[PDB]
Amino acid sequence: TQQPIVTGTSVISMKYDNGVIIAADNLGSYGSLLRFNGVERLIPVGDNTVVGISGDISDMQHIERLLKDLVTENAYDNPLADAEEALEPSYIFEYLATVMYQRRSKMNPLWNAIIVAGVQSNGDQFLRYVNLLGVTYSSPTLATGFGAHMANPLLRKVVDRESDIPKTTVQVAEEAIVNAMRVLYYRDARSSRNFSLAIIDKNTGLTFKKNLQVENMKWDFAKDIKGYGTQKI
Amino acid sequence: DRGVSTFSPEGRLFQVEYSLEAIKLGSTAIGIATKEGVVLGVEKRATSPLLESDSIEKIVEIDRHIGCAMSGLTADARSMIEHARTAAVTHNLYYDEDINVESLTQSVCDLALRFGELMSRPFGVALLIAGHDADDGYQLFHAEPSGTFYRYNAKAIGSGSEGAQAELLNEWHSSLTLKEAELLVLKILKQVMEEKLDENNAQLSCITKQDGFKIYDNEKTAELIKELKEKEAAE
Amino acid sequence: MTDRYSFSLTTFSPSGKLGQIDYALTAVKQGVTSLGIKATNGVVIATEKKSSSPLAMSETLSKVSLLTPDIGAVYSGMGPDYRVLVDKSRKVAHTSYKRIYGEYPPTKLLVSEVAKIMQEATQSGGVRPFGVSLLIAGHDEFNGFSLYQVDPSGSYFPWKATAIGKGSVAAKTFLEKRWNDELELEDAIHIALLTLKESVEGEFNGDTIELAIIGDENPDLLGYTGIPTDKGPRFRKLTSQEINDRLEAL
Amino acid sequence: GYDRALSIFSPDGHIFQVEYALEAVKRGTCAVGVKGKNCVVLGCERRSTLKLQDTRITPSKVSKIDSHVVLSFSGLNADSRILIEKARVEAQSHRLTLEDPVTVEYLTRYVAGVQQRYTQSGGVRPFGVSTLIAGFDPRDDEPKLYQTEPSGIYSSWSAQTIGRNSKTVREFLEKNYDRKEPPATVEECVKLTVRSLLEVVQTGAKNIEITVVKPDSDIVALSSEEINQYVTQIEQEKQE
Amino acid sequence: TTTLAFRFQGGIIVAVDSRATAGNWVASQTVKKVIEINPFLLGTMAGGAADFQFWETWLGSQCRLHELREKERISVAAASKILSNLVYQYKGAGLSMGTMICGYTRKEGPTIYYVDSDGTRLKGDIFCVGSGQTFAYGVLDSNYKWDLSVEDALYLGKRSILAAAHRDAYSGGSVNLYHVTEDGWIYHGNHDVGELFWKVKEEEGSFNNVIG
Amino acid sequence: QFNPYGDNGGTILGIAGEDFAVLAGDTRNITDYSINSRYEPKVFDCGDNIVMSANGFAADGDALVKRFKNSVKWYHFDHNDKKLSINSAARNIQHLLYGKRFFPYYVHTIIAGLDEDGKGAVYSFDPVGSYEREQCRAGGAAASLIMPFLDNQVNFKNQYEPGTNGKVKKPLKYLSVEEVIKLVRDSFTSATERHIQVGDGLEILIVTKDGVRKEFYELKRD
Amino acid sequence: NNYDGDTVTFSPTGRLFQVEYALEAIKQGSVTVGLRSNTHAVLVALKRNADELSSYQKKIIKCDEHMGLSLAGLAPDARVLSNYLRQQCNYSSLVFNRKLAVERAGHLLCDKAQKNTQSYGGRPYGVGLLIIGYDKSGAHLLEFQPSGNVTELYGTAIGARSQGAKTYLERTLDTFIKIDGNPDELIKAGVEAISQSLRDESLTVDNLSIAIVGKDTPFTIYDGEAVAKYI
Amino acid sequence: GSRRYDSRTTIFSPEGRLYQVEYALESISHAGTAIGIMASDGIVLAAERKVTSTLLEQDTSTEKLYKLNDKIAVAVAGLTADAEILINTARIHAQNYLKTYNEDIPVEILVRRLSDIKQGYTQHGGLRPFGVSFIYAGYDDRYGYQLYTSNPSGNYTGWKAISVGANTSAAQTLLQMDYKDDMKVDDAIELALKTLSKTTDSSALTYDRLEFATIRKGANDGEVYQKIFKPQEIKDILVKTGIT
Numbered sequence A: 001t002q003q004p005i006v007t008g009t010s011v012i013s014m015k016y017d018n019g020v021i022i023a024a025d026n027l028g029s030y031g032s033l034l035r036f037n038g039v040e041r042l043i044p045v046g047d048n049t050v051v052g053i054s055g056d057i058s059d060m061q062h063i064e065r066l067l068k069d070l071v072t073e074n075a076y077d078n079p080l081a082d083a084e085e086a087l088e089p090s091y092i093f094e095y096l097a098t099v100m101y102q103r104r105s106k107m108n109p110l111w112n113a114i115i116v117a118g119v120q121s122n123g124d125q126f127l128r129y130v131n132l133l134g135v136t137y138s139s140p141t142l143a144t145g146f147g148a149h150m151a152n153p154l155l156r157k158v159v160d161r162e163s164d165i166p167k168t169t170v171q172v173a174e175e176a177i178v179n180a181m182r183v184l185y186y187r188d189a190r191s192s193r194n195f196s197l198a199i200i201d202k203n204t205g206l207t208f209k210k211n212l213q214v215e216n217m218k219w220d221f222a223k224d225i226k227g228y229g230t231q232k233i
Numbered sequence B: 001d002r003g004v005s006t007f008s009p010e011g012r013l014f015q016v017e018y019s020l021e022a023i024k025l026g027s028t029a030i031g032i033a034t035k036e037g038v039v040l041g042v043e044k045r046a047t048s049p050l051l052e053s054d055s056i057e058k059i060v061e062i063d064r065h066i067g068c069a070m071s072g073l074t075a076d077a078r079s080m081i082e083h084a085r086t087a088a089v090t091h092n093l094y095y096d097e098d099i100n101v102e103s104l105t106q107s108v109c110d111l112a113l114r115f116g117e118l119m120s121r122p123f124g125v126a127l128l129i130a131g132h133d134a135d136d137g138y139q140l141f142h143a144e145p146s147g148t149f150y151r152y153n154a155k156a157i158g159s160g161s162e163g164a165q166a167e168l169l170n171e172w173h174s175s176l177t178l179k180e181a182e183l184l185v186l187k188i189l190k191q192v193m194e195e196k197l198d199e200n201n202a203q204l205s206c207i208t209k210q211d212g213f214k215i216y217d218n219e220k221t222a223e224l225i226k227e228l229k230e231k232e233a234a235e
Numbered sequence C: 001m002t003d004r005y006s007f008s009l010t011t012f013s014p015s016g017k018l019g020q021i022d023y024a025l026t027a028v029k030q031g032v033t034s035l036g037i038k039a040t041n042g043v044v045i046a047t048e049k050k051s052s053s054p055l056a057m058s059e060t061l062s063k064v065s066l067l068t069p070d071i072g073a074v075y076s077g078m079g080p081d082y083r084v085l086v087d088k089s090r091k092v093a094h095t096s097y098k099r100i101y102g103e104y105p106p107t108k109l110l111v112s113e114v115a116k117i118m119q120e121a122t123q124s125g126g127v128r129p130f131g132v133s134l135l136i137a138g139h140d141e142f143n144g145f146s147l148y149q150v151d152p153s154g155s156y157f158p159w160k161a162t163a164i165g166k167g168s169v170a171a172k173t174f175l176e177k178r179w180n181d182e183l184e185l186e187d188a189i190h191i192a193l194l195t196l197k198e199s200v201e202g203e204f205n206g207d208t209i210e211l212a213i214i215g216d217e218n219p220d221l222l223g224y225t226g227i228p229t230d231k232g233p234r235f236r237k238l239t240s241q242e243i244n245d246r247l248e249a250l
Numbered sequence D: 001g002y003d004r005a006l007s008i009f010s011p012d013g014h015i016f017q018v019e020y021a022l023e024a025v026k027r028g029t030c031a032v033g034v035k036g037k038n039c040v041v042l043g044c045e046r047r048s049t050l051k052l053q054d055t056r057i058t059p060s061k062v063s064k065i066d067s068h069v070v071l072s073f074s075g076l077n078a079d080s081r082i083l084i085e086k087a088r089v090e091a092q093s094h095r096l097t098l099e100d101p102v103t104v105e106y107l108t109r110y111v112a113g114v115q116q117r118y119t120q121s122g123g124v125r126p127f128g129v130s131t132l133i134a135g136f137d138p139r140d141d142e143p144k145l146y147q148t149e150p151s152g153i154y155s156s157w158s159a160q161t162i163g164r165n166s167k168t169v170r171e172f173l174e175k176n177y178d179r180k181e182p183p184a185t186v187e188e189c190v191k192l193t194v195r196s197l198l199e200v201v202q203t204g205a206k207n208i209e210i211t212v213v214k215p216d217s218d219i220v221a222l223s224s225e226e227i228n229q230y231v232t233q234i235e236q237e238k239q240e
Numbered sequence E: 001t002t003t004l005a006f007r008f009q010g011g012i013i014v015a016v017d018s019r020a021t022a023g024n025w026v027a028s029q030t031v032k033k034v035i036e037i038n039p040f041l042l043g044t045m046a047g048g049a050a051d052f053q054f055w056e057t058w059l060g061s062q063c064r065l066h067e068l069r070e071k072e073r074i075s076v077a078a079a080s081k082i083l084s085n086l087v088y089q090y091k092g093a094g095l096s097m098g099t100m101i102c103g104y105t106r107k108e109g110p111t112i113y114y115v116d117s118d119g120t121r122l123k124g125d126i127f128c129v130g131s132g133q134t135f136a137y138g139v140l141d142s143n144y145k146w147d148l149s150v151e152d153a154l155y156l157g158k159r160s161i162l163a164a165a166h167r168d169a170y171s172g173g174s175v176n177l178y179h180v181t182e183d184g185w186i187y188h189g190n191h192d193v194g195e196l197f198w199k200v201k202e203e204e205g206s207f208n209n210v211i212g
Numbered sequence F: 001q002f003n004p005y006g007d008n009g010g011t012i013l014g015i016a017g018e019d020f021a022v023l024a025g026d027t028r029n030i031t032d033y034s035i036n037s038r039y040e041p042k043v044f045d046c047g048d049n050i051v052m053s054a055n056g057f058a059a060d061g062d063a064l065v066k067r068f069k070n071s072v073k074w075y076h077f078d079h080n081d082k083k084l085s086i087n088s089a090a091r092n093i094q095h096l097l098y099g100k101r102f103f104p105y106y107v108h109t110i111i112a113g114l115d116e117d118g119k120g121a122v123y124s125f126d127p128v129g130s131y132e133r134e135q136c137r138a139g140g141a142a143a144s145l146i147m148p149f150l151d152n153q154v155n156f157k158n159q160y161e162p163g164t165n166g167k168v169k170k171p172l173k174y175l176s177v178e179e180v181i182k183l184v185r186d187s188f189t190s191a192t193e194r195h196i197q198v199g200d201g202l203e204i205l206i207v208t209k210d211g212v213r214k215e216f217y218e219l220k221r222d
Numbered sequence G: 001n002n003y004d005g006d007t008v009t010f011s012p013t014g015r016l017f018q019v020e021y022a023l024e025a026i027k028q029g030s031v032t033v034g035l036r037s038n039t040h041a042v043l044v045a046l047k048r049n050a051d052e053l054s055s056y057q058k059k060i061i062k063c064d065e066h067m068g069l070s071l072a073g074l075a076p077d078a079r080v081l082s083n084y085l086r087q088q089c090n091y092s093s094l095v096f097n098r099k100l101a102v103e104r105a106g107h108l109l110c111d112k113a114q115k116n117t118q119s120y121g122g123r124p125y126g127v128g129l130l131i132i133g134y135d136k137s138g139a140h141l142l143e144f145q146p147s148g149n150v151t152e153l154y155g156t157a158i159g160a161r162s163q164g165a166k167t168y169l170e171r172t173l174d175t176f177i178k179i180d181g182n183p184d185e186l187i188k189a190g191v192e193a194i195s196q197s198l199r200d201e202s203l204t205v206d207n208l209s210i211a212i213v214g215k216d217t218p219f220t221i222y223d224g225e226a227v228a229k230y231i
Numbered sequence H: 001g002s003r004r005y006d007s008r009t010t011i012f013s014p015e016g017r018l019y020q021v022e023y024a025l026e027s028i029s030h031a032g033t034a035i036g037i038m039a040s041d042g043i044v045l046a047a048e049r050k051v052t053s054t055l056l057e058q059d060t061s062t063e064k065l066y067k068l069n070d071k072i073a074v075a076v077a078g079l080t081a082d083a084e085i086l087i088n089t090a091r092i093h094a095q096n097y098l099k100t101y102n103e104d105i106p107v108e109i110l111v112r113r114l115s116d117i118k119q120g121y122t123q124h125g126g127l128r129p130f131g132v133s134f135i136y137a138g139y140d141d142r143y144g145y146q147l148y149t150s151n152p153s154g155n156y157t158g159w160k161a162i163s164v165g166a167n168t169s170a171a172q173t174l175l176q177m178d179y180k181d182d183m184k185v186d187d188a189i190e191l192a193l194k195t196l197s198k199t200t201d202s203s204a205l206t207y208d209r210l211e212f213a214t215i216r217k218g219a220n221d222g223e224v225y226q227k228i229f230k231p232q233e234i235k236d237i238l239v240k241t242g243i244t
């Protein structure tokens, strides 16, 4: 039995025609205190997978070490470690999913919501979710925390079902993700302006973007708003 | 001395090979498989006339569809039977069905090599496991202390085994009836036994799909002995 | 891995001898002479300090050891075996007695506990017997002064006076002539020094002899005042100077 | 824990430790069991090199396992206590779970199973003991006599003997015991048991113990004078 | 649930309802509350469903192992005690069980043992267990005799379940009858309460309060 | 305090015919008032012509199916590739579920297939292992909506023969695969209308002697 | 001589005699052959019977849908090791959703066998194994020895008179390696290979045992009338 | 491994004897003789100390005779250290029985348990047996005065008069000659000393080479008293019977 202390907020993601995009802000909250601002919550595994983590940061750092150790262990006695027998997104996910469910079954969970985004060896897009309860699910768009409530509605307007994936380009997809991050900054009280974004493409590979900022924000209309009803001046 | 799980220079386990010698000293047991059923028969071999021979239990039920005959250090067989019975019933509990005769034999044979320095020595007893299931029909198995089992159309184990096996080689064919097999076990037992064969020093049993595993009465076997003697005199 | 020696290494031979115990006693025979004498108002235990090298500081090696404030021990045989027995003996005095009764054990009972430890090394799996004989001197309120010998087998006997080790046969004969039931403590120290000179060959002084007593209470050695019932340890190790004083009037 | 495999096979296929345990049984004092038409009688030898004994307190050779079953033995005395204790515990455990006392066959089977376990367990030697277990099943009047031995094999006997010079008394019983007509009464069964021991014992004084068991938990041990009367009667008929 | 079992001249009658509820929701009308332990023994469901099912199936395995080892039919006393000793080990853990272990042997005759998850083990002539036990007891007590016929006994058990099925909201669906003899139990069919009620109402004249 | 259970919603439905059996289930996955996935299958082919679904808490549901699938695999290894009969699978699942009696799998389990006579078979389980063979069973969030409809349309409950004064019941008969699928589709569209956790899509697995076939139908996405 | 009492003892020339005696049990075992192409891998095994009344001891065991072995020596030891492989293949599937590489399968068997050669009380395994499989890097053939030594090969053979088949495969290397997209021809080559180890006996319908795994072929075993095609 | 160095203490000889038990008995046969004699009104325990030295403290010494409880005592023959292990176990067992049943332990029950412990060391564990033989002298309200003996085999028997240790053959013959059933304690005291005096390997039997004890009902009304004799009391009883 736990309670989360230092926490990370929404992780959002979606599929597009050639790959997957995933994003998460760089904040480590300590309750209402916005304590840490340099926290990277997207962690690449190889050149074909990105694990996005929300929830408890101490448990996130534990999961980082496990993934780091998984790459080391896979390389042992493996001449094809950088080829056919490299770590797939599906392998990395199933490993984490196993751990998350085992920990919940011992009444001592890793207090996280995790999204594993990547591209398989045959070119297929991989995007699947897992959390502290061991619950797993996949969808064209996936998001955690507030992202589930606010991002998914926006991302589902682009890709509403399977057949919309080939029709969606990387430009259109990234635009939707960056827009979703702005909306979350408007509305999530435990979000920051600074964030990271990762694109895993079947052709161009892994593109990791750091130190992005929410921009083109609408605040100007605030000056006209006066009082809460009957106030004029 | 020397290790219990040691290999000989020829590539055999000393203790397993020595336990096979113990089985050769044991009383004879014969099994014959037919399309109408499997027959199991044993030599009781009472050490003294004061011993009540009906208390000599060398044929044993494992389940309704599986029977067992033994030869060698018969005391060692008790825990093997106990395991077999539990394995059979446990499988029925987990799967709501009868267990395959081969699967049962394999389970019993897993105990065999669980010895060393687990129990202190191999089993000094060989088993003939007979039974029926829906998949492979009527079956007879020979389970050794080596952990190995062979399926047999017919098989003899014990002191008169090599002589009886040579006899079973000639007599067995794929169209034997149950009654023919019953007489054939009695015939071959009478040949290899020291004392004269009768209903008190020899025991018969069979397993059929319809009636399951049955140990024959001394009255029933006595008639089959009388029927056997008459048929041999008739030519 | 793991201790596979779960069986006895000491067993009965056809003649009824326990070989390892006999061989342990042989090791004690080879060891340096030590002795103990019981007086009316005290007990004295003594031994020679056989130095392994003149560069070695023989003060750092203590053959005579305090077990409780009123009990002391000396040995003959293998030193390392003695050292670990003293460690164990000191601890068992606390665990199996002082932590229960709030007072130190009487001599006979502590001796009994040490014997138990030595008996178990004679019967338990994968161990040899202790290669030492102990002489334990001590005092307690209800038994007075006492002296005990403990052998490798775990057997123990009470003595008026005795000697063990190298020249024990000659030393025991010497003590039989000199010992009486009216000996004062100072007389017993005098006899102890006389007996020990016979077995010692080289130098004979306070630096080559180790000697301690169980006598009167020593309030100056207690380390604190304020509790009337606590009067100090009856065990006292004689100093190098205190020995030489008695060697002049010898 | 001490693990050594003490009981092991030899080249010729024998387990010497079990066979040497039988030699301990052969050294033990003779014990005999004879069952009649409505009873079983357990006879036991007591060696007479021990005078100044106290027969009030000395452990008796025949032991009650329950109110309806008895156990006598031949071999190491100390070993027999361990078997008797286990048997007595199992007897009560059976009453507790099955709500019915053990059958003589069941109790024998248990004891035999313990003996067998010590022939293929690490760190232990076999029991140097063979037993005769006798009694009557609950609500049954058919007499039961069973024998066990160190190896673990057990079997039923119309009459049987174990211990030293047992081959002599077995020879006697084999010609004197009729299967078609067992000792019809208690007197006849006790006499045949005493007769058989008199082939081996020496004197019929304080050397023979006799215990009679009858149906429905009816067990009683005979005294010296009672046994001596059988000894006196047999010798007078012998001089003929 | 409503289950009953009673000893009489012709052996034992066992009768049970068929309903299973999860709160107000009727989960099943076709549940089997009689377990066929072996051709000579029967057991009844009340309380936990999986438990009754799991452990009385297990009991049948223990009874089979008994008669393999002892070459003799297990007594009703011994069989019932194997179950009661088992549940007693689990006492406190939360097992829910109320069952009649019913059988007919040579040495005992017809025998019924009430076994409980509290560890209670009671031998008796008449038992009723379940939410509608009190309704069944009323019919049983006023009509029971040792010298009932197999035909009249079967009906009494059927009628007593019907009584409870009617009044008790958590009982009904259908009635399963069994008749236990020394040579084994004999099934006496599934009887839908919907049809049985009207049939009984007319032929018996009972249930005049209800309009048909 | 940490709560190890959750509710992933959804609903499932199994019907048995004469020589076939269907096991249907919606493809929606939810937590609270959010949709996790519009297409997340929870009806699985487990081999040996056995289809299975464990609806309720998805983590427990996936664990159970994974374990049973593995049970089928080891049954083949240990018993000479013998086919696991639907009745044997049912008993095996009871032991899986009851194995966690005091920390249960929060799922209503249903399996479907053919019995050893070739006839359609549906078995249904409670969370702790009690099971029962039936012609008909709905499970999950909308079970209470669908089940009474099945009683009426599959087993013809409360339906009497016209003009017989309510004395002769409507006779029981097997339904065709075409008729069964109609009832499944109407059951789920009705459940989708009145239950918020039911919708998005419907996936049906049909089991005949020839194998396992699939059919998919859109459901309302609100 | 004095240094063969147990596996924990080295001889003066640095030999482990108990391991060598375990190796001897393999030589007494019936012949079995392994060979592969780029698309498929094949096991062929000569089964052995007790007499004419007995069955023929099964030599081939399935480990997963994509892997399996043939045995030569103590059959129970093969059952222990195959069971271990089944679990390891299965752990890889459940935890990582990943088919176990045939190379890792060998590494695991090597390490399991080794622990039995360095500790007191235990004994070496008394069986040799030929593991075939198809994984992400194509077809594979391994040879396991109870010393611990595992070796990857194009083809090989173990058991009595295995040298005949091993020589044949060494000659046929260039031919059979390129039998791609043709199962029946690769088996024919394996059946011809094992025939070089036969003496007085020939391949019959209940004597021969064949197994195959490949690109679009799960590990499947052929016995009885199914191998009549290849005689 | 370690198999090489295992003596195998718990195995049978080809003749069916337990090697280590036989050799332990051979060890005990060299130990100082101990005699127990049971009279109608009490029990005597006499034991000879092993070759004494003149500088041995005699009064504050215990070698042969030990007290198990107020009603039971034992005489030792063999390894003293081994006997003390068993004595402390026997003492605890008596207190366990008293704690449980609120009654003093019956003599036989205590003897059986101690004998069962010895048996265990001969059948399992791979350890050497206890090189000890006991003579148990005690009283309870069931059988009254009782004498038993146990040996390394774990076998025990009851006696009217018995010896253990050295020269038991000669000692048992002498006891068998002069013992009779209606004997009193004071007569038994005399028999015990006379027997030791003839069987001793020493030149003459003196007070300083003996341990002596009686268990009488010689207390006041229906209660038992244990008397472990002091040196001066042995000196007097030795003069009173005319041995010195």
Ligand SMILES: [Mg+2]
Pocket (backbone or CB within 6 Å): E164, E165, E166, E167, E168, E169, E170, E171, E172
């Ligand atoms: Mg109702």
Ligand SMILES: [Mg+2]
Pocket (backbone or CB within 6 Å): F221, F222
């Ligand atoms: Mg909606």
